[PDB]
Amino acid sequence: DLELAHEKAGQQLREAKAQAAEIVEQAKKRANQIVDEARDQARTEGERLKAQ
Amino acid sequence: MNINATLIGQSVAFFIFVLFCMKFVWPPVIAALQERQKKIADGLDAANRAAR
């Protein structure tokens, strides 16, 4: 049971590393989307060359 | 001769068997009891340590 507990701890540890990597990966993907939408808003805001 | 020197004949046999038992019969058997108590104790300690 002690040997099996060390093997289980080895799985729980690496699964937590993988999930933490995916949580930060999705955050970086979300951050990239926010800045690109902000670039399109700032590019569209240029309507002032004619709307004004 | 006839009755009392048997009082020392039996006494000598008694002391010889007691010293033989004390060195070649009792220590080898009591050690196996000491070891098993540790074999069971190590299992209970390992289970608590593995859980924690």
Query: CA of A1: which chain B residue's CA is closest?
Result: B47
DSSP E strands, chain B: none
Chain A closest-CA separation from residue B52 CA (Å): 10
Residues with Cβ < 8 Å from A26, sequence gap 6 or more?
A: none
Tell me the C-alpha to C-alpha distance, in Å, between residue A43 and each of A29, A34, A35, A39, A40.
Answer: 21, 14, 12, 6, 5
The span from the CA of A29 to the CA of B39, in Å, is 55
Size of interface A-B (CB pairs under 8 A): 10
How were these coordinates obtained? cryo-EM
d(CA A15, CA A9): 10
Residue A12 forms contact with B (CB below 8 Å) = no
